[PDB]
Design a protein around this ligand. Structure first.
Ligand code: NAD
Ligand code: NAD
Ligand code: FE
Ligand code: FE
Lengths: 383, 384
């Protein structure tokens, strides 16, 4: 049988964070720790929430110590701030980095033997649900509000590790494009292609089945339709991206991903490469590698990305799907090669061994060898 | 903004009930009350679950008093059994009637001021979540496992009332076609067109938006593709129907339905008409009534039901969608007329007023008058 974990409650649309104070009052929670980053405080995005909480008389404290590719240090520090705050629930405001940090804090707070953080890697055998989490994404996006995953960086071991735990699922998600509009174009582009990567990898993952296929192909259609418009600053395209990125995530932790995420994680660990940029550069090269192991699915991908697939052979349609992703990457300004973003050619064997051992790689529809992953890094590294 | 309430955890596929014992152990629950009906005991469907619970050493008691179109009396009886069982959680085994009874028991147990049951109608002002519910559907189906609704019959007032409450959402749903295979063909057919009705009414409902449109149009495609095979006893078609009926429910309480459910409820209240059969007979007639107020959506319905809509006018595509539903009803043996299931012509004005006031009717894309609903009942009743 196939398991689906989803948010029991989610609010969608501009103004969705307007539902938060009523959700808190109905659940009887007394005090939030807001888990976020310094940028979202400074840009006034956190105030969009705390102004409503103040008006409603709801107490909060803040941890804004999250940094991109959050580390064991960031988690332990946040846990300390949570313990001292007296908070009884968590509000995650931000992209994947604050949402994942918030998941780690909420899990460890109710499962304190996991305070080393490393021991959470894999299918975390936690006895207790997380401290309740209300999740508010500000990127479009990681879908961290709806997955059972969180990704922590072990700086000492120079690796990203994935923690997979039904106990971390947020109680309520608020998917509000008002919270996302401040993303600079380059961040809309990067997080948008991360969302497309979730949807494409989830569509073709080894565990794919009818329900996740339906969700993923819809998310591909929405994201391919909206991303150029959103990067260009269109408000309605931004709301479409907010939905598309969430739908993309409804499959991620339920069926899995593949070698794009597998190969992106080591770049984040080695260089602190933004997750979305790493995925975007790798995506079309890994799609080419996987093409002949995906049955009819690249014809579907090409079709919903606006390719006229009628009369194409399956091999032509597969090529067309890859070219449609190359074209989207060029149009939204993703750097074309890994060498552009400071990846070192001599690190490729170490990156390739890290990618081969990454949990995401196991979902890849083609069984990757060390040599295959080395060649893929080389293909993505330079013209 | 649009709210979606869904199951936090759901298991899908043949053998999904195999996940139940590990779910109970993980949540630390001590003793189940199983809420079900006598048919499911007799046919050995309940034993498919209790044998697994017995094997895993999990304690259970049973209330098997549920009847179709469950009454206030059935809710109070089941509540008494729950109170005296020492159970700390609920397992709903059955179609909409057991799943709705189970929601009522679970809500009233943690909100004991609603023991009169009538006080739950509408947006139930409950303060506490239901006793935790693990939902196992045996029809395909009402999708009661994933909605926040439950429908109770007030025998004294001869009416069905809808209770709407986020507090009633089951914690886990187990959607297992092994639990559904034993439905008689006529019940597969009726519950299957009820599922199609949820998907079609949900697709065209006034509150429809992008996410529910995507889910509903997929559910229509799955159900239209699978229902003939499932009724005929095809194993894979049965598994497809188990998924399609669930997806068809992901909008029932999230966006709403319309006049098919609005007109079906009074038939249940007046005659004890099976919910599925009532909806199946009404569906194509109400679709015809609604057609010109549904934008492009019947072209989408016609397309996923196998109609070649290329070069069709919008009205040709609408007529083809309606014809495809009439054809499916004939093809799985739904009775053609309300007269065939004992609906009385002289009751139509009373049925029409009840339908006009039904909560479901508010979602209908065409604004229905009493006179419109009287005429629709006549169209669905007549052998002409
Ligand atoms: N299943 C999961 O939980 C999951 C899935 C995908 C990725 N991830 C993880 O998520 C992380 C990446 O998250 P991300 O891509 O959302 O970025 P992020 O959270 O790392 O943020 C990137 C930068 O964008 C800024 N930013 C975010 N929202 C902004 C806004 N609205 N306006 C202005 N600036 C804004 C942040 O302050 C930060 O400087 C990685 O660690 C990745 O591994 C986890
Ligand atoms: N959102 C909701 O909660 C929701 C949605 C739609 C309908 N409903 C309600 O659900 C009820 C109808 O439920 P239903 O259509 O599933 O039917 P049901 O539960 O009323 O059952 C109908 C008959 O089928 C039998 N049966 C069920 N499963 C069987 C199986 N596997 N094998 C053999 N016999 C089986 C039952 O014993 C009964 O005799 C109505 O009261 C309706 O209002 C509620
Ligand atoms: Fe990602
Ligand atoms: Fe129904």
């Amino acid at each position: 049988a196939n398991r689906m974990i989803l948010n029991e409650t989610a609010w969608f649309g501009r103004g969705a964070v307007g539902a938060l104070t009523d959700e808190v009052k109905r659940r009887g929670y007394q005090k939030a720790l807001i888990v976020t980053d310094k940028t979202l405080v400074q840009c006034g995005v956190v105030a969009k929430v705390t102004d409503k909480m103040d008006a409603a008389g709801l107490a909060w404290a803040i941890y804004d110590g999250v940094v991109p590719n959050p580390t064991i240090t960031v988690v332990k520090e946040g846990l300390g701030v949570f313990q001292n705050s007296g908070a009884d629930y968590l509000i995650a405001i931000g992209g994947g980095s604050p949402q994942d940090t918030c998941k780690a804090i909420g899990i460890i707070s109710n499962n304190p033997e996991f305070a080393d953080v490393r021991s959470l890697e894999g299918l975390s055998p936690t006895n207790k649900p997380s401290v309740p989490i209300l999740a508010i994404p500000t990127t479009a996006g990681t879908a961290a509000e709806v997955t059972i995953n969180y990704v922590i960086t072990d700086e000492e071991k120079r690796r990203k590790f994935v923690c997979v735990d039904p106990h971390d699922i947020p109680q309520v998600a608020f998917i509000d494009a008002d919270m996302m509009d401040g993303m600079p174009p380059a961040l809309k582009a990067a997080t948008g292609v991360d969302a497309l990567t979730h949807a494409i990898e989830g569509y073709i993952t080894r565990g794919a089945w009818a329900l996740t296929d339906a969700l993923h192909i819809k998310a591909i259609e929405i994201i391919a339709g909206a991303l150029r418009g959103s990067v260009a600053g269109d408000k309605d395209a931004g709301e479409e991206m907010a939905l598309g990125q969430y739908v993309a995530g409804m499959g991620i932790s339920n069926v899995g991903l593949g070698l794009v995420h597998g190969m992106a994680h080591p770049l984040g660990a080695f260089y602190n490469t933004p997750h979305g940029v790493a995925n975007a550069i790798l995506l079309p090269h890994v799609m080419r590698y996987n093409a002949d192991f995906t049955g009819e699915k690249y014809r579907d991908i090409a079709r919903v990305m606006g390719v006229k697939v009628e009369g194409m052979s399956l091999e032509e349609a597969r090529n067309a799907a890859v070219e449609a992703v190359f074209a989207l990457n060029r149009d939204v300004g993703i750097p074309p090669h890994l060498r552009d973003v400071g990846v070192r050619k001599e690190d490729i064997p170490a990156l390739a061994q890290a990618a081969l051992d990454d949990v995401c790689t196991g979902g890849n529809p083609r069984e990757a060898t060390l040599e295959d992953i080395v060649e893929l890094y080389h293909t993505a590294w330079t013209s």
